[PDB]
Coordinates of C-alpha atoms in Angstrom, one line a residue:
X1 CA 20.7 7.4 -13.8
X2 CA 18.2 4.6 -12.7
X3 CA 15.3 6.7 -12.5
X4 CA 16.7 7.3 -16.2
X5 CA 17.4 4.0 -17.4
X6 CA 13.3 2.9 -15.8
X7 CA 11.9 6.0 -16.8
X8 CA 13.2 5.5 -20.7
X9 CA 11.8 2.1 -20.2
X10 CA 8.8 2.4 -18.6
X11 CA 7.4 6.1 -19.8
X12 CA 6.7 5.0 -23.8
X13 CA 5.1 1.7 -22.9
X14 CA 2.5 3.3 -20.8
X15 CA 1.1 5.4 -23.1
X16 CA 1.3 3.5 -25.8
X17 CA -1.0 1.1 -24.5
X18 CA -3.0 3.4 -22.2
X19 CA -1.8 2.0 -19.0
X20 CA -3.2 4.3 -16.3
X21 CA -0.8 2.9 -13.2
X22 CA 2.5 0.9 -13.4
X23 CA 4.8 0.2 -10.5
X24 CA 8.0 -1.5 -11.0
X25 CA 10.5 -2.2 -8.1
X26 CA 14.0 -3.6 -8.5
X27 CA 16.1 -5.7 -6.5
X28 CA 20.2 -4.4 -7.2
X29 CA 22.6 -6.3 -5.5
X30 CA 20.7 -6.5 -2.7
X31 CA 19.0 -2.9 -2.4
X32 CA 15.5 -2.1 -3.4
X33 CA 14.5 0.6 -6.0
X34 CA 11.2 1.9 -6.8
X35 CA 9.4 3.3 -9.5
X36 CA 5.8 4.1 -9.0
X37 CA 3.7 5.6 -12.5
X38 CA 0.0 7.1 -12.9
X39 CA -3.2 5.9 -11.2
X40 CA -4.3 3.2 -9.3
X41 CA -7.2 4.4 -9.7
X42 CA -8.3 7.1 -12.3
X43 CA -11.8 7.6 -11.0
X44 CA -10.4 8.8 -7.4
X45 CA -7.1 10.1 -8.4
X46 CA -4.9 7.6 -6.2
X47 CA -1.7 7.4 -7.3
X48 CA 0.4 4.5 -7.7
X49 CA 3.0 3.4 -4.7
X50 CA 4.9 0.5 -3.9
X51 CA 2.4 -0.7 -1.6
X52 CA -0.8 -0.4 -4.4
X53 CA -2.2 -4.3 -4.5
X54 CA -2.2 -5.2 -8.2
X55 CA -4.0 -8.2 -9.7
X56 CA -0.6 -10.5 -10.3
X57 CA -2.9 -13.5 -12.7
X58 CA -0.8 -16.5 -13.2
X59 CA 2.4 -15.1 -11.9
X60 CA 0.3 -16.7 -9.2
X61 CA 1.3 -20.0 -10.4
X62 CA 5.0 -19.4 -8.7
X63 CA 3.4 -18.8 -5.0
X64 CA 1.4 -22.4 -5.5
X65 CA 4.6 -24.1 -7.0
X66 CA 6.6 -22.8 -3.9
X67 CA 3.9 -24.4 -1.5
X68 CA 4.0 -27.4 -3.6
X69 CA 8.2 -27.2 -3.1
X70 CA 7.1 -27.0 0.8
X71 CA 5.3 -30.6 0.7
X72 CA 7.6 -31.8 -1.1
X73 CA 10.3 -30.5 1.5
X74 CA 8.4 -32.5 3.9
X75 CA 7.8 -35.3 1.9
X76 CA 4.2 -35.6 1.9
X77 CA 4.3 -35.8 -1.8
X78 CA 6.8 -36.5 -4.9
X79 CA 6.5 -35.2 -8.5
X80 CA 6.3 -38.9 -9.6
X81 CA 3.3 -39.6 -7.4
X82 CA 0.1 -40.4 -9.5
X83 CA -2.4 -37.1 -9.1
X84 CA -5.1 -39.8 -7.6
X85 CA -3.5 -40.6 -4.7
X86 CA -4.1 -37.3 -2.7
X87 CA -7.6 -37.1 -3.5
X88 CA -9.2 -40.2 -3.0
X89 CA -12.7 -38.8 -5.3
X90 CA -10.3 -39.1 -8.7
X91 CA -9.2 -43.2 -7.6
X92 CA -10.5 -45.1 -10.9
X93 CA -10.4 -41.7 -13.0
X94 CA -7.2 -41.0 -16.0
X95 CA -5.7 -38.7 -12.9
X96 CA -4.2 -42.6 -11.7
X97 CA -1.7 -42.6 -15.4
X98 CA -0.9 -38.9 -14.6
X99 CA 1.7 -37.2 -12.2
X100 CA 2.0 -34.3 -10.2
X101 CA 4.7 -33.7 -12.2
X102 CA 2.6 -34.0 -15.5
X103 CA 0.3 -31.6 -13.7
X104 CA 2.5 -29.1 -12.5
X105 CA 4.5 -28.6 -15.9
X106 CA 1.4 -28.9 -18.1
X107 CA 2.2 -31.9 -19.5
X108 CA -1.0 -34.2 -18.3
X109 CA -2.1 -34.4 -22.0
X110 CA -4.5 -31.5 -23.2
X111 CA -6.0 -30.5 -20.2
X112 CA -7.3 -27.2 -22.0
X113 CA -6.0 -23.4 -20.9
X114 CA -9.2 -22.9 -19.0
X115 CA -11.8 -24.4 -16.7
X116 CA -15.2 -24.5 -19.4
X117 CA -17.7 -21.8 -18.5
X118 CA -19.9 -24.7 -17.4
X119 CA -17.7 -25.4 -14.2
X120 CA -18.5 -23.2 -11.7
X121 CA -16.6 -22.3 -8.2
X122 CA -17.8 -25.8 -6.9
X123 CA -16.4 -28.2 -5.4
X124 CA -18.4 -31.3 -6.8
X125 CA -18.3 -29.4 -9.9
X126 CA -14.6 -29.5 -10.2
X127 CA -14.1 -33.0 -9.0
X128 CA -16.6 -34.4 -11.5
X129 CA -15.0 -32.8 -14.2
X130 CA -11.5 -34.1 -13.3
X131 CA -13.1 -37.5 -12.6
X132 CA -14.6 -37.7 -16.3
X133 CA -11.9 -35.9 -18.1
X134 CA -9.5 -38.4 -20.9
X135 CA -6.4 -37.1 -22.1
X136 CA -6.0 -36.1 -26.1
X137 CA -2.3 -37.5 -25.9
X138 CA -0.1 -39.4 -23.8
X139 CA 0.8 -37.6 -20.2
X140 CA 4.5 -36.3 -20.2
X141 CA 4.8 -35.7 -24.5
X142 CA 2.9 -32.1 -25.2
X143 CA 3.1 -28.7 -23.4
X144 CA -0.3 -26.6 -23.3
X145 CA -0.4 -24.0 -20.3
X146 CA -3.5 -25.0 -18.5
X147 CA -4.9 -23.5 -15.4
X148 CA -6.6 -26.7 -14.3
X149 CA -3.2 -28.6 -14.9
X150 CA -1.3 -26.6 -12.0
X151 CA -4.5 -25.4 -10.6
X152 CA -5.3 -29.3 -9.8
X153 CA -1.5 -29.6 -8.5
X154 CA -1.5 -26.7 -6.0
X155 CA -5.1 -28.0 -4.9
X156 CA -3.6 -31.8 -4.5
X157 CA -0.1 -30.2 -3.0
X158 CA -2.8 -28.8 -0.2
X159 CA -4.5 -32.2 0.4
X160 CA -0.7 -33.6 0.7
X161 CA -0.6 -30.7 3.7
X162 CA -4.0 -31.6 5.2
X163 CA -5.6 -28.2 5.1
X164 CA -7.4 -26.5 2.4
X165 CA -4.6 -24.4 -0.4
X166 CA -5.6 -20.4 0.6
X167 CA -5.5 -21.7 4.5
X168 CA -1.4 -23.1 3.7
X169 CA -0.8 -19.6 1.8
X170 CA -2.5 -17.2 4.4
X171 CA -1.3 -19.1 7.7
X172 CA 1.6 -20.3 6.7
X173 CA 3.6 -19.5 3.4
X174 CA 3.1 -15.4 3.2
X175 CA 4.2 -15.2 6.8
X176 CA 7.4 -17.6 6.2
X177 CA 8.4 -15.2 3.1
X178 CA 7.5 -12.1 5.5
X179 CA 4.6 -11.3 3.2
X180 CA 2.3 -9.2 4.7
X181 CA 1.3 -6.8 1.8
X182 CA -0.1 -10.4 -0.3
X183 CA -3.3 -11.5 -0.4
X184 CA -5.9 -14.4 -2.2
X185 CA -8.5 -12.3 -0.3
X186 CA -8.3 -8.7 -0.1
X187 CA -9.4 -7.7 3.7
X188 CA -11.4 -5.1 4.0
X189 CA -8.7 -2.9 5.9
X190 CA -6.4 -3.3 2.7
X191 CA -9.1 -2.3 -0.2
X192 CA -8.1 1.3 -0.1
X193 CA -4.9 -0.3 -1.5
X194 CA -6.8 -2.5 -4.1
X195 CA -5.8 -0.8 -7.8
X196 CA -8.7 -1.1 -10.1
X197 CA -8.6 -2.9 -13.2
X198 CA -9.2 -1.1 -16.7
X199 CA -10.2 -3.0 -19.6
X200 CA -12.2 -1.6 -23.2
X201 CA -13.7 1.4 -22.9
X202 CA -11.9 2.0 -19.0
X203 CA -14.4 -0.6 -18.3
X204 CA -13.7 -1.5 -14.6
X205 CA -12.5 -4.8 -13.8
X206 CA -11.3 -6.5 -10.7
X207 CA -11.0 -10.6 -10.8
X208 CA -14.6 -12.3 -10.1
X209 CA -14.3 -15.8 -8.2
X210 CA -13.4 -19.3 -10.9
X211 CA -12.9 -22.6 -10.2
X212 CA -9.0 -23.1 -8.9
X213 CA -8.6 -19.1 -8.7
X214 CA -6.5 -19.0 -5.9
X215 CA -4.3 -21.7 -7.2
X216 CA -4.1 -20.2 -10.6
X217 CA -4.6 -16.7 -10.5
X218 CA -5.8 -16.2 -7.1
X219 CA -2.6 -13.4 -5.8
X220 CA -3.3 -9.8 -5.1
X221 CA -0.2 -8.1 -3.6
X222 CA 2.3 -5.0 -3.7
X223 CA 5.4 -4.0 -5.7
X224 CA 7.2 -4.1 -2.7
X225 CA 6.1 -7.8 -1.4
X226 CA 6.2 -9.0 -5.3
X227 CA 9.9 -8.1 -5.0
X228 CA 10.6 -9.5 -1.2
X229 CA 9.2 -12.8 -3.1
X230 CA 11.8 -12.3 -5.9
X231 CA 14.3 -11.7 -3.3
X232 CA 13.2 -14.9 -1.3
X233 CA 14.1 -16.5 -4.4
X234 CA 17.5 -15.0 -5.5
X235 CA 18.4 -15.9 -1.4
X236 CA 16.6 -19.1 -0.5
X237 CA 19.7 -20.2 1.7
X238 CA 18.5 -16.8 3.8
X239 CA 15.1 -18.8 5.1
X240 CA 14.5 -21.2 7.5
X241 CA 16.0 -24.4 5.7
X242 CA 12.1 -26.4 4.8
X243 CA 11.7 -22.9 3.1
X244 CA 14.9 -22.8 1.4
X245 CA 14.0 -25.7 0.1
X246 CA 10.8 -25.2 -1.4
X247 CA 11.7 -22.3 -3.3
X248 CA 14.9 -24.1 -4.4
X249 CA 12.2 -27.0 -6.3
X250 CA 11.0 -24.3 -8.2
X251 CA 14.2 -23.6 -9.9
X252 CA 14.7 -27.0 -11.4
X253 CA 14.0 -27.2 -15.3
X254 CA 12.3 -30.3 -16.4
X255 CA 11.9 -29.8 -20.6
X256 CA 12.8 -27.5 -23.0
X257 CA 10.0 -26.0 -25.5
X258 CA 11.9 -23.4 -28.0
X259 CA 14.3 -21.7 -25.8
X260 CA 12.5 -21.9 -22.8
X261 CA 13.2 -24.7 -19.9
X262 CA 10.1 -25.3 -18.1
X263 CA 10.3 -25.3 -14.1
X264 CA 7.6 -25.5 -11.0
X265 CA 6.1 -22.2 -12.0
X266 CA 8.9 -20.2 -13.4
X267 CA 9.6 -20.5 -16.6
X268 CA 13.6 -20.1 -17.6
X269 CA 15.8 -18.5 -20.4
X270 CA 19.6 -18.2 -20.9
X271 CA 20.6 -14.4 -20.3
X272 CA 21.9 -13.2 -22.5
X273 CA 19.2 -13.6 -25.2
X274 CA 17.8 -11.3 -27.5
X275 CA 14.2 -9.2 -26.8
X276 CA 12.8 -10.7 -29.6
X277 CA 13.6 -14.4 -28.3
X278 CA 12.3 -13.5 -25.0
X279 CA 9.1 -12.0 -26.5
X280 CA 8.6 -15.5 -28.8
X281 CA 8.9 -17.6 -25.3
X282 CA 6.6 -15.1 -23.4
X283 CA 4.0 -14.9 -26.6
X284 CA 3.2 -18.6 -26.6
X285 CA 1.0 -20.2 -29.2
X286 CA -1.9 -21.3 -27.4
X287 CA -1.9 -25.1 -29.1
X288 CA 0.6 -27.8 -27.9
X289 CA 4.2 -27.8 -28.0
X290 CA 6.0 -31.4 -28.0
X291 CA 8.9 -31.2 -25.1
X292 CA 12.7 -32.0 -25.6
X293 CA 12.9 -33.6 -21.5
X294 CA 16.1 -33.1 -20.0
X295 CA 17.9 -36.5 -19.0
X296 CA 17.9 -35.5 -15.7
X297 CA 16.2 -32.1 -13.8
X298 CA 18.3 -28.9 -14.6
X299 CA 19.7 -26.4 -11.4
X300 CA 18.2 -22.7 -13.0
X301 CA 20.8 -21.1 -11.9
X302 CA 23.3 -19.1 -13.2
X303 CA 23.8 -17.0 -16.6
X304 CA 19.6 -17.5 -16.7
X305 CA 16.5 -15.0 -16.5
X306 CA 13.9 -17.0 -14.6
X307 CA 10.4 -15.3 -15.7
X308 CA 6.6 -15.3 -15.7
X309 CA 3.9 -13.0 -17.0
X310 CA 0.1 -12.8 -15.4
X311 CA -3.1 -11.5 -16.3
X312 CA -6.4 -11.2 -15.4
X313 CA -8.9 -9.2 -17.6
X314 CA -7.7 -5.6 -15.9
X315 CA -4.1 -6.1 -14.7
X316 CA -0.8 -7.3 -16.5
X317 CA 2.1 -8.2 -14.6
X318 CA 5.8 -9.5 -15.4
X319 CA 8.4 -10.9 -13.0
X320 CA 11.9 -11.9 -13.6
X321 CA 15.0 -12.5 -11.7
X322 CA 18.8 -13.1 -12.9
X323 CA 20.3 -15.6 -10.2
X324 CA 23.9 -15.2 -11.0
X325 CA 23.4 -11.6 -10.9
X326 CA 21.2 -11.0 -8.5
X327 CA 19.1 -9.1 -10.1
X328 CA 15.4 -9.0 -9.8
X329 CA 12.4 -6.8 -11.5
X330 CA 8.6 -6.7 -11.2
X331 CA 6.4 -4.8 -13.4
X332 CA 2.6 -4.5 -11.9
X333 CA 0.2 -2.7 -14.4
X334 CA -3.7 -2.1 -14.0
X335 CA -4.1 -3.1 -17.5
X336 CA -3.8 -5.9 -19.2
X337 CA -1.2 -4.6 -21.9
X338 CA 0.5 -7.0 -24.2
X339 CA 3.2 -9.6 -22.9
X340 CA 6.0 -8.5 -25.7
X341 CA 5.7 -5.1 -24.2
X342 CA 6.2 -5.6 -20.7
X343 CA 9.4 -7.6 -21.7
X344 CA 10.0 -4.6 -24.1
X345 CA 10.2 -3.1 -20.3
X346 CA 12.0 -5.6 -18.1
X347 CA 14.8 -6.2 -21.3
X348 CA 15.6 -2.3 -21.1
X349 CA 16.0 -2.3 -17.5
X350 CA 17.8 -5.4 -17.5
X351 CA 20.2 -5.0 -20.7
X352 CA 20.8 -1.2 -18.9
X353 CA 21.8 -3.1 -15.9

């Protein structure tokens, strides 16, 4: 009946957008289930499995905000610290009127959606364009999803720590989830598990390097990990407590844009809610939003689907989790297929469940 329930789900939106490898797993009061679809890759015939790596993109963005909840578990930094203070290079620069907050929740004031082609990987090259960058609007009034907004507070977050950001994930936060299927740097041992990526014409695409990629869109990983990370955070109480605690900071909502409550990463709805809401909130507009803030921080807990999508030019991915009832889905594709369908997905499963 499951197999069903995915297979009526899944089977319709893969070849409707030509998706040539699809893995879903589910978490079901507290039992795995998986579903594994098509090719990893179509040039060698490798099938799809739980443990195929896919290209996650800015679903990304919830393994930084849980190493940013592990600082601030240790209180090395707070949300209402100025950016400038854990990098002394951006002292005197607009980053001492913005917070990590701000940063983390997109809310610094216009930093764009993406690095501009003329920063490179560099590491002068990113700090001098933080240090000259001015705000459009005041920090902390207008939503636009930027990479170099949380990109900059997963790279402060690691200065906070002392050690460089893919160091903190590789050394210490995979092995404290039990991740060892999740990578920002495919070894060499793992490539035969590396999907490829299909774009136009079954071009072949796997992510090149960008400034702040491993803080923004820097996760390759498995079905199977994606979803011991979904069931990290439907149990933090079940880690070791600094842990529990950084995955519990990103399930606080902050503001309110439509029917969405922002959090550290995930991004929260009230369940139920109609597809077509959930669709809206997950096909953003990609100019700013003005916030309703909460009076105080929100618990996302409860009769709520905490969500995020992720691409990168060859995969599409969608994660989402019901806390009160514990319930969690990922949905890994090798082709960057349109959000509203791969909640036309997750909703079947979901609403069937």
């Amino acid at each position: 009946r499951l197999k069903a329930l995915v297979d009526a789900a899944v089977q319709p939106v893969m070849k409707a957008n030509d998706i040539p490898g699809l893995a879903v797993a589910i978490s079901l009061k507290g039992e795995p289930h998986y579903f594994s679809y098509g090719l990893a890759s179509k040039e060698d015939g490798r099938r799809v499995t739980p443990e195929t790596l896919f290209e996650i993109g800015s679903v990304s963005k919830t393994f930084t905000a849980t190493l940013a909840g592990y600082a601030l578990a240790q209180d090395k930094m707070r949300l209402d610290d100025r950016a400038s203070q854990h990098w002394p290079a951006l002292q005197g620069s607009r980053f001492d009127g913005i917070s990590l907050l701000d940063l983390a929740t997109y809310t610094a004031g216009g930093l764009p959606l993406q690095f501009p082609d003329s920063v490179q990987k560099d590491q002068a090259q990113i700090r001098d364009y933080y240090r000259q960058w001015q705000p459009t609007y005041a920090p902390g009034s207008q939503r636009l999803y930027s990479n170099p907004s949380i990109g900059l507070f997963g790279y402060l977050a690691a200065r906070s720590l002392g050690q460089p950001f893919e160091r903190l994930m590789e050394q210490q936060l995979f092995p404290a989830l039990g991740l060892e299927q999740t990578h920002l740097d495919v070894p060499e041992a793992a490539l035969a598990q590396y999907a490829q990526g299909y774009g136009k014409d079954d071009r072949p695409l796997r992510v090149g390097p960008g400034p702040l990629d491993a803080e923004g869109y820097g996760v390759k990983t498995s079905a199977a990990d994606l979803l011991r990370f979904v069931d990290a955070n439907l149990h933090p109480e079940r880690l070791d407590r600094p842990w529990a605690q950084a995955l519990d900071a990103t399930h606080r909502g902050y503001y309110k844009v439509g029917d969405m409550t922002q959090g550290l990463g995930w991004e929260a709805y009230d369940w139920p809610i109609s597809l077509k809401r959930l669709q809206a909130g997950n096909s953003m507009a990609l100019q700013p939003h003005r916030i309703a803030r909460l009076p105080a921080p929100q618990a996302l807990e409860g009769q709520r689907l905490l969500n995020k999508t992720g691409s990168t030019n060859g995969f599409g991915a969608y994660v989402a989790f019901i806390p009160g009832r514990d319930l969690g889905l990922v949905i890994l594709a090798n082709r960057n297929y349109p959000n509203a369908e791969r909640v036309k997905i997750a909703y079947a499963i979901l609403s069937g469940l």
